Symmetry: C3
């Protein structure tokens, strides 16, 4: 498209919401290509990541870890206003894996505290894609401080299975998985700091072990449980978008499956089916579609079970509805 | 199906066999859906995992690590009687990744020492799938103590390639891969413990390093070598089912290939072909089909070669038959 | 038949050092051939980082990785492998592309002062790892750099999943190496007189499963700066990537993998529109991309600690016209 053609396209302003929720959207595109406008303010802030009060100096798009999910359709333009307030200490930028050119946008969006920028790119490829900050010379430090999220570029006709039949979800959730590398003192207690830069050298030492101290969803151990358990009902179709900007993960719905899984996250690559555990490499997003068939509590985990149940990578679903004894029944309950 | 309909189905009792062997079965289903009955007794038992005499307090379905392979067909019911003898010390349960509801069955099968339970589930999806114990709050400790195996749910019409041509194996082996996390003393020698509980705290410390001390097939370094090497012949079609309940692996047949590999383990997901090294994420099973073409000794490994050759993840095949100089020949033997 | 195999033409090919690739045609020229290559093994000290850190490299053809050999399906690859008398260790070669004798390793064990010639039929199309594998010291040779890859092209060249031809303008081979360099009690990397002197200390590092360095083309920054790979807007590039011991997850920063044979095997349909692909340890993969924007790209293992702390980052320098439709700065960084 020419500059004039793009200038004539309709604009739509979107209001972002905090993960694991996703902002309002339509699965099938409403009308032709649009310039979809988003704004995010970067917040450097302390987050508490476990029940021992361990702290991370988060670098948080829109104030959350992960940053929020942006949803557009293929061949829309995504136009992001990114703001780095004067209250922050570091330069930041943004790299969209969905975008083409200038290091995904990072080369055009380096903003010091007190600066803003507006980047537009054409969403040419359908899928879920990571975005993350990447300041030259400081790239993994910002990413493993939580400065990452994802977008979804839906096909204009919505999702389809590998034989071209529509797949339409009732609910969508976005699970951002984060590896953290928290320094410890000589007695094994996690260290606290009173500015992000003060933690840099100690954190790099831990990073270089390639062994996270914490692996968490939505920024903290237990975050997506209790008050933040995800919900569904028997018969409901749910899309679970999962990202990991730095490190591999292997998602698994305990008690369920991934009926269709775009494990690479790219919708023109046919989905795997009937999955027990899928695999998303560091630096990518993936998506799983499931229809719930049983009520009750489910756990949703990274299925390195040490990562899930020692290091923090476990969420819950609470599902309502009627139990199906054909699918599963206790013929003899635990007894002497 | 209604309760009355399920009650009218034929029952078939199966006698399990120890890995890497697989109990007798038919690739193509014989007759309509059946309730296929299995029994396993859980044994907490000391095992030796290397030639030095290193011990683990294993938690072993049917007394083996891995637990045995159960084989059914799609839309059969798997009915397991699980027994936790009074000689054991811990509560145990079972989660079938093939099943739907109640955390794969774990929520319905929590049995204390001196208890049993019977779980029935409908095997709705074709593939190989992990099963493992998962007591709330103690999940990875049981799994990495060996309390895991796999099942195979064959399509009722047997296996096919991605384009609908039948694939019929001559024999099948089940390789369960186990990551162990054995504590060491200040001399760097592995520790021994009187009861399983005494090892817990020390073992969790090793687990949290995400670095196993041992990575083994069939419960020990070298378990599938010597007189326990797997066997085949030139022309023979072999299915190798491989599981890893906790941690990634990358199987490879040294001197061979995976002609067809269901790397995700799910038979409705078309197999990859001509594979050198395939990838099975922690929490999953996969399956590879190969027709042997050359005689001699092969090694079957996890192709992180440190894991294979330092940590234990290497098996052997002995293969009979005639050497094929078209496929490979030594034109000049090592010489001055 | 025996006479048919003996009657096939034999063709010698001159190798080139990675990341470049020797002369070849994408579509096969003529019928099956026995394609002859020669490599000399070099044991030598290399410096792998900006601090003067040394590895005793074990290098096919003198490079880490060893060079890419290119044949077509149903050709034969006939390698003369030479272990000069100045070396100290026995070596061999395992081709993952080959069938039998542990990929060739069982037939090619050569002591210093020996050579051998191995022929195998390249029956399966794809990119495949090759590596040294002396029994009982396999990972040590591999993680000392003694690995590379081959490409077995389909006789009709590459195609997408719908049978449309994919023809590259250029090809690069990125071999990724995990190194495990011992350190003294003060954290300084150790140096050794002879390769064997480092064996025990190195195995201790290996068993941590944590590399000290993860590099392309044998050193931190080997494919950056003035050694960046190059392309132009509109150019179609195939990037072959291998890792003989350890997983990797390649990513072109600012680009994509338009078609990715992530398993490396061309009869397995390629994934499309990839952000980051995954190659397990012990395998090669290949990605096809048409460049659409000029400028500097990074190409990384997208464990960004591995990329930007441990060494696994390369660059492409791309010429041509910027496309504002694909991306534009609506408002440059400003107050
Ligand atoms: O599926 N239980 O980890
Ligand atoms: O294929 N030898 O690891
Ligand atoms: O795609 N930036 O690592
Ligand atoms: Cu930042
Ligand atoms: Cu990135
Ligand atoms: Cu148990
Ligand atoms: Cu599980
Ligand atoms: Cu060697
Ligand atoms: Cu190998």
């Amino acid at each position: 498209a020419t500059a004039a053609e793009i200038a004539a396209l309709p604009r739509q302003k979107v209001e972002l919401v905090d993960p694991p929720f996703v902002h309002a959207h339509s699965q099938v595109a409403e009308g032709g290509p649009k310039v979809v406008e988003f704004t995010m303010v970067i917040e450097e802030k302390k987050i508490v990541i476990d029940d021992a009060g361990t702290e991370v100096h988060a670098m948080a798009f829109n104030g959350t870890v992960p940053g929020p999910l942006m949803v557009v359709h293929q061949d829309d333009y995504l136009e992001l206003t990114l703001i780095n307030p004067e209250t922050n200490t570091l330069m930041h930028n943004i790299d969209f894996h969905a975008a083409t050119g200038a290091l995904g946008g990072g080369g055009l969006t380096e903003i010091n505290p007190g600066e803003k920028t507006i980047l537009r790119f054409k969403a040419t490829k359908p899928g879920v894609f990571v975005y993350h900050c990447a300041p030259p010379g400081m790239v993994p430090w910002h990413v493993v401080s939580g400065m990452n999220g994802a977008i979804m570029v839906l096909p204009r006709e919505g999702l389809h299975d590998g034989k071209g039949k529509a797949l339409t979800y009732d609910k969508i959730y976005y699970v951002g998985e984060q590896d953290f590398y928290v320094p410890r003192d000589e007695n094994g207690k996690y260290k606290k700091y009173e500015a992000p830069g003060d933690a840099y050298e100690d954190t790099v030492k831990v990073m270089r072990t390639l062994t996270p101290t914490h692996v968490v969803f939505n920024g903290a151990v237990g975050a997506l449980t209790g008050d933040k358990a995800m919900t569904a009902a028997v018969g409901e179709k749910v899309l679970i978008v999962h990202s990991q900007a730095n490190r591999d993960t292997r998602p698994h719905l305990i008690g369920g499956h991934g009926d269709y899984v775009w494990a690479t996250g790219k919708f023109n690559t046919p989905p795997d089916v009937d999955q027990e555990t899928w695999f998303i490499p560091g630096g990518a997003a993936g998506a799983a579609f499931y229809t719930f068939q049983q009520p009750g509590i489910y756990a949703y985990v990274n299925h390195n079970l040490i990562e899930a149940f020692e290091l923090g990578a476990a969420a819950h679903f609470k599902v309502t509805g009627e139990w199906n004894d054909d699918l599963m029944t206790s013929v003899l309950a635990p007894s002497g």
